């Protein structure tokens, strides 16, 4: 597997916060590998919330941070509620994938082979 | 570490200073020289 030249605890925390924010936006801009490896993660989170069982609910609350989207009309819910109430249905038929990715150009500060990631 | 020059204003003005160097003939000798060089500054 890949390490990111970063420590394990920082790494895990980064990935989970990543997928959180991702769920908020439905797409984001970042680098390549960080996307490559939040890929499988959030695919598995979808594979969970496709079921809605309380066990999976519990298993997901491990990874999802404790966050509040203010949805439209002054309506609020969490990433969890969103996942188990809005998104499972969407790919309820599908058997893999669930995301896609978009190569882009380098950044200025670096040779950052950056990428957008989104849902499919 | 400690290096030198832990300053004190008053001490500077004491071992140096106008009223200091003007007490002694061997003090007053130099002001002439600083004035002789036209060194801008005294004490």
């Amino acid at each position: 597997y890949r390490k990111l030249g970063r420590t394990s605890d920082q790494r895990k925390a980064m990935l989970r916060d990543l997928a959180t924010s991702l769920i908020i936006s439905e797409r984001i801009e970042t680098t390549e590998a960080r996307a490559k490896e939040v890929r499988s993660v959030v695919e598995k989170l979808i594979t969970l919330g496709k079921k809605g069982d309380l066990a999976s609910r519990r298993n997901a609350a491990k990874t999802l941070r404790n966050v509040e989207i203010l949805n439209e009309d002054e309506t609020t819910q969490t990433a969890l509620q969103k996942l188990f109430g809005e998104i499972a249905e969407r790919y309820t038929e599908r058997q893999g994938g669930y995301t896609r990715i978009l190569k882009q150009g380098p950044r200025r500060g670096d040779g950052a082979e950056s990428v957008i990631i989104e849902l499919v | 570490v400690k290096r030198t020059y832990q300053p004190n204003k008053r001490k500077h003005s004491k071992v140096h200073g106008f009223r200091k160097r003007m007490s002694t003939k061997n003090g007053r000798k130099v002001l002439a020289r600083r004035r002789r060089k036209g060194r801008k500054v005294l004490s």
């Binding site: 150009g105 380098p106 200025r108 040779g111 | -």
Partner: protein
């Protein structure tokens, strides 16, 4: 036929930039711009800026066709190096270089 443009005393080393310039020697203004917009250095966009003004000259002033325009020649040469310092607990210093960029573009004719 030809037009000039020149960047005076640019805060880059000639060796930093001579390579990004050693490609478009002999090419067209069109492909060259693309190359400049693809290479991920910091010399590139500057050179692009220069090129755009060069052809602004060649058009507004001499009014030649912006498609049969090849790169006639392009280089850069040294400039007025300046100097700065380095703490190290005791004296030390280094130089910041510069560059004189020159690009001439022709309609490949007389």
């Amino acid at each position: 036929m030809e037009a000039k443009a020149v960047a005076r005393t640019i805060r880059i080393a000639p060796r930093k930039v001579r390579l990004v310039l050693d490609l478009i020697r002999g090419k067209n203004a069109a492909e060259a711009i693309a190359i400049l917009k693809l290479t991920n250095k910091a010399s590139s966009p500057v050179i692009e800026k220069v090129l755009m003004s060069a052809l602004a000259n060649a058009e507004h002033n001499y009014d030649m066709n912006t498609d049969e325009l090849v790169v006639k020649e392009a280089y850069a040469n040294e400039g007025p190096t300046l100097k700065r310092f380095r703490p190290q607990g005791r004296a030390s210093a280094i130089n910041k270089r510069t560059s004189h960029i020159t690009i001439v573009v022709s309609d490949g004719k007389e």
